[PDB]
Amino acid sequence: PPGPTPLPVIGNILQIGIKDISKSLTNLSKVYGPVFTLYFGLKPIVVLHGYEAVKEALIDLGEEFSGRGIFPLAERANRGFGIVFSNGKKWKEIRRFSLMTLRNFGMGKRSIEDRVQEEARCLVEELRKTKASPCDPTFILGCAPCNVICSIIFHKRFDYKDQQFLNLMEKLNENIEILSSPWIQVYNNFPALLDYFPGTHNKLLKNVAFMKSYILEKVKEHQESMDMNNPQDFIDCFLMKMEKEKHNQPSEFTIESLENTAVDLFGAGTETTSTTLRYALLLLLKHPEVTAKVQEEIERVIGRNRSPCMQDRSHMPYTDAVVHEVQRYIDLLPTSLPHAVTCDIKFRNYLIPKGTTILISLTSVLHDNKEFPNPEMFDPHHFLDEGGNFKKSKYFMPFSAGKRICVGEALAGMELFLFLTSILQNFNLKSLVDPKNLDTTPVVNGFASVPPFYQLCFIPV
Ligand code: HEC
Ligand SMILES: CC(=O)C[C@@H](c1ccccc1)c1c(O)c2ccccc2oc1=O
């Protein structure tokens, strides 16, 4: 498994960096091929680059590449396994369960779509409160996704002002700010620095503990008020799954793992959806041509009366294309989340030892040159055939693919569509600075992409 020969202790840091480490991977693939080795300090990593190599690993050899890889910082900042950081039987079981409860009608009488439709109405309520004045959408947009998860786990969304909510929001946001500081990377290359400067990770652990104890409060309220026969949320389902397991036992389902699975969902379900929404509005501000066509579809398919629903997406190929294009263009998780091989595998004549960390280049699939002609540009036609119909692609991998594919793929797509169509149905977007002037190019800091700062006005139609 070829790759640049590492220096004594610093590894390949001089070539990949700490900056846009995704750009370096693409450049490195031009010289070492689709399957190459990289060193983050002493740790050996295998990077998979093209669609062919990603498909082959994630799908063809799905089981073998279903392990979750964990870097030094993440390892020290995590106490307890839920779904995101889990491996083996613990992962397999908790994930299967979560996917089951996350079905549209997998948690009682009320559907996920319904909880998302209520939030969309509320999102609009809040944007109306801005009275069409210059606004930084970062906050409002972040509240909606967090609240959807709150609704799924507690059965009750919160008013955007409830203190419980703001505390939860604050911790989630604090953790992001920390994980998004460049220098975090120094820890991944030099794990010993964790012992010397523990401030970072002690803080993440603290924040997680705050959230766990807060969720514990909730599960305790749920253990009291629980009507087995009538589950209403993720907790109710978890609690009653524990009862199905009371007789088998040692068991993967515990209050501990419930707390861990709950925070994982808040963490994995908030930030990325939030950032995508913010990035979508920026792009819509930049391309009013595009926004006008999306509004044409809204006006014709959905009234201005009723609220959007998922049934409408099929009759809204342009909007669907715009949303797909937003995710494809922004490349939020350029290297997904680290994977690890489940066993000693032979891959494309290479030989990768059990436990080896695997980095999946989502960028390289999302920005494939043949599939998406001018990949670096925002163009909804990337998902439209000659007739204005939705043109799907197997290269559309923003949620990754295979056994570890985003558990919230359905939920996220539901939020993006309903929130965005709801916003554009009730408001027109006005930029203060003017379009031709603002830049939409992603800013990257470590292993996550984000948009630049901007403001806009939500003008009622
Ligand atoms: C349930 C709420 C939820 C929402 C909403 C959500 N995710 Fe996830 N996502 C998860 C969970 C849970 C995992 C962990 C999956 C695992 O480790 O098995 C995950 C994992 C991922 C991964 C890991 C891929 C890999 O190969 O392991 C990527 C990439 C990802 N999500 C992208 C996204 C994007 C992009 C969005 C939205 C724009 C999004 N997610 C929204 C829950 C969510
Ligand atoms: C936060 C970190 O120190 C590194 C981070 C990461 C993300 C993408 C590609 C490489 C490294 C990381 C995670 O976000 C992560 C998330 C869930 C489970 C395990 C993880 O391990 C990581 O290293």
Swiss-Prot record:
Pathway: Lipid metabolism; arachidonate metabolism; Steroid metabolism; cholesterol metabolism; Terpene metabolism; (4R)-limonene degradation. Changing R115C: In allele CYP2C9*2. Changing D331E: In allele CYP2C9*5; increases the K(m) value for substrates tested. Changing N175H: In allele CYP2C9*57. Disulfide bonds: none annotated. Induction: By rifampicin. Changing P460S: In allele CYP2C9*12. Keywords: Endoplasmic reticulum, Heme, Iron, Lipid metabolism, Membrane, Metal-binding, Microsome, Monooxygenase, Oxidoreductase, Steroid metabolism, Sterol metabolism. Changing I330T: In allele CYP2C9*4. One of its GO terms (biological process) is xenobiotic metabolic process. Its EC number is 1.14.14.1, 1.14.14.53, 1.14.14.51, 1.14.14.52. Changing I405F: In allele CYP2C9*59; produces warfarin hypersensitivity; increases affinity but highly decreases enzymatic activity for tolbutamide; no effect on affinity but decreases enzymatic activity for diclofenac; decreases affinity and highly decreases enzymatic activity for losartan. Its cofactor is heme. It comes from the Eukaryota. One of its GO terms (molecular function) is arachidonate 11,12-epoxygenase activity. Changing E243G: In allele CYP2C9*10. It is a peripheral membrane protein. SUPFAM superfamilies: Cytochrome P450. It catalyses: an organic molecule + reduced [NADPH--hemoprotein reductase] + O2 = an alcohol + oxidized [NADPH--hemoprotein reductase] + H2O + H(+); (5Z,8Z,11Z,14Z)-eicosatetraenoate + reduced [NADPH--hemoprotein reductase] + O2 = (8R,9S)-epoxy-(5Z,11Z,14Z)-eicosatrienoate + oxidized [NADPH--hemoprotein reductase] + H2O + H(+); (5Z,8Z,11Z,14Z)-eicosatetraenoate + reduced [NADPH--hemoprotein reductase] + O2 = (8S,9R)-epoxy-(5Z,11Z,14Z)-eicosatrienoate + oxidized [NADPH--hemoprotein reductase] + H2O + H(+); (5Z,8Z,11Z,14Z)-eicosatetraenoate + reduced [NADPH--hemoprotein reductase] + O2 = (11R,12S)-epoxy-(5Z,8Z,14Z)-eicosatrienoate + oxidized [NADPH--hemoprotein reductase] + H2O + H(+). A cytochrome P450 monooxygenase involved in the metabolism of various endogenous substrates, including fatty acids and steroids. Mechanistically, uses molecular oxygen inserting one oxygen atom into a substrate, and reducing the second into a water molecule, with two electrons provided by NADPH via cytochrome P450 reductase (NADPH--hemoprotein reductase). Catalyzes the epoxidation of double bonds of polyunsaturated fatty acids (PUFA). Catalyzes the hydroxylation of carbon-hydrogen bonds. This is Cytochrome P450 2C9. It comes from Homo sapiens. The gene is CYP2C9.
